[PDB]
Amino acid sequence: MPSIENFLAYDFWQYDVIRHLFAFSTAVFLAGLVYFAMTARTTAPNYRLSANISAVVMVSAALELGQLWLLWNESFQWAELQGSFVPVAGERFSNGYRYMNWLIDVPMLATQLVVVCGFVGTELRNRWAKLTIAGVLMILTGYVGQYFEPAVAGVPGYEGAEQFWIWGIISTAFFVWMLLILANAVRNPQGAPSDEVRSRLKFCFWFLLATWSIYPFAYAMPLFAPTADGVVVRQVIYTVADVSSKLVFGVILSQVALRRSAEEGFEPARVASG
Ligand SMILES: CCCCCCCCCCCCO[C@@H]1O[C@H](CO)[C@@H](O[C@H]2O[C@H](CO)[C@@H](O)[C@H](O)[C@H]2O)[C@H](O)[C@H]1O
Ligand SMILES: CCCCCCCCCCCCO[C@@H]1O[C@H](CO)[C@@H](O[C@H]2O[C@H](CO)[C@@H](O)[C@H](O)[C@H]2O)[C@H](O)[C@H]1O
Numbered sequence: 563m564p565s566i567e568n569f570l571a572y573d574f575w576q577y578d579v580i581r582h583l584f585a586f587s588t589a590v591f592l593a594g595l596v597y598f599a600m601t602a603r604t605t606a607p608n609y610r611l612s613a614n615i616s617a618v619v620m621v622s623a624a625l626e627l628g629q630l631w632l633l634w635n636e637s638f639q640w641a642e643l644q645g646s647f648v649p650v651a652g653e654r655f656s657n658g659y660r661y662m663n664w665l666i667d668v669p670m671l672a673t674q675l676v677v678v679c680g681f682v683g684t685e686l687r688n689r690w691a692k693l694t695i696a697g698v699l700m701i702l703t704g705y706v707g708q709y710f711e712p713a714v715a716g717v718p719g720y721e722g723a724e725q726f727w728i729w730g731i732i733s734t735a736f737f738v739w740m741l742l743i744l745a746n747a748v749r750n751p752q753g754a755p756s757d758e759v760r761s762r763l764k765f766c767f768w769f770l771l772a773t774w775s776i777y778p779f780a781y782a783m784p785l786f787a788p789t790a791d792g793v794v795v796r797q798v799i800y801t802v803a804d805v806s807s808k809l810v811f812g813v814i815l816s817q818v819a820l821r822r823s824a825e826e827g828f829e830p831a832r833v834a835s836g
């Protein structure tokens with residue numbers, strides 16, 4: 563079944579805002595990529611994998627929010643007689659472009675925190691092989707329950723609203739579990755860090771927990787408000803949870819990594835940062 567976007571008529575502002583936020587978190591992911599590729603030579607070689615990953619999750623999200631921008635632009639056309647952007651009769655818009663490119667981001671947003679915490683070799687690969695299982699078994703489960711939007715929302719003719727709940731609870735069951743490996747790789751850092759860079763990991767973890775709980779709120783939105791200004795609101799909180807969980811989180815992590823690479827002894831990070 564299509565999304566709940568194609569069953570509604572969007573006014574001028576209700577459509578312009580949504581395409582504007584699709585262009586905004588692409589002009590920002592094509593700027594974060596250039597920033598993360600320009601000051602990736604500052605972190606020490608030990609924690610430069612965390613800066614390379616940060617440059618990967620920006621190129622792998624620019625094509626995620628720019629291929630959805632095109633899909634949003636060609637799916638809807640203005641209709642002056644009505645006064646709204648009615649859906650076109652040939653193309654159907656689906657937000658599932660996000661959940662297919664969340665397979666490159668959900669793993670490589672905790673793999674770059676397990677790296678910053680100081681985990682090397684087997685201790686990092688084993689903890690990556692669990693997060694990359696918890697992140698492709700939670701997103702591939704929330705991606706099955708995404709297809710029952712018009713059924714949970716109440717569109718007449720569409721049935722199967724129970725699957726929206728069923729395939730949504732077996733996604734927060736892995737989202738909670740992934741936090742249990744992210745909070746045992748952050749409460750136990752390696753390399754004997756100082757008490758101030760040990761309290762910044764226990765901030766980068768809460769900044770990852772508090773931006774990953776906006777996605778359960780922005781999917782279950784057709785349950786609550788399946789309207790034009792419940793789609794406008796849901797593409798606001800999937801961008802305030804995008805530019806603040808792939809960009810702000812990466813920049814915050816690039817400072818706690820620079821603090822380790824300025825107390826271990828690296829000079830290009832000890833001169834350019836404290
Ligand atoms: C939109 C693309 C991304 C834009 C990100 C903008 C970040 C700057 C916003 C203000 C943050 C204030 O905090 C400031 O952060 C910058 C960047 O992390 C740090 O800057 C330090 O680390 C960065 C990243 O390795 C180096 O390029 C820089 O030479 C160095 O000074 C400062 O030491 C810190 O004081
Ligand atoms: C879309 C591609 C994204 C690629 C991101 C890959 C990250 C996932 C790695 C999982 C764990 C494997 O084990 C870990 O691998 C990384 C990368 O190979 C190694 O990392 C090492 O090699 C890489 C590549 O030469 C260097 O950039 C890095 O500075 C260095 O530490 C670690 O020493 C190892 O402990």
Ligand SMILES: CCCCCCCCCCCCO[C@@H]1O[C@H](CO)[C@@H](O[C@H]2O[C@H](CO)[C@@H](O)[C@H](O)[C@H]2O)[C@H](O)[C@H]1O
Pocket residue numbers: 590761762764765805809810813814815817818
């Ligand atoms: C829209 C344009 C693109 C985005 C540009 C903006 C990016 C900004 C990134 C930098 C954010 C500021 O950097 C982050 O600030 C918070 C402020 O509470 C600091 O956190 C600080 O306060 C907390 C809360 O008391 C303490 O637990 C922590 O020890 C302390 O360092 C983080 O250690 C630092 O990493």
Ligand SMILES: *C/C=C(C)/C=C/C=C(C)/C=C/C1=C(C)CCCC1(C)C
Pocket residue numbers: 664667668671700701703704705730733734737773774775777778781803804807808
């Ligand atoms: C940049 C990519 C990010 C931050 C990915 C975040 C992913 C999630 C938090 C997904 C979790 C989900 C649930 C907890 C319930 C079902 C819906 C999901 C799949 C969006």
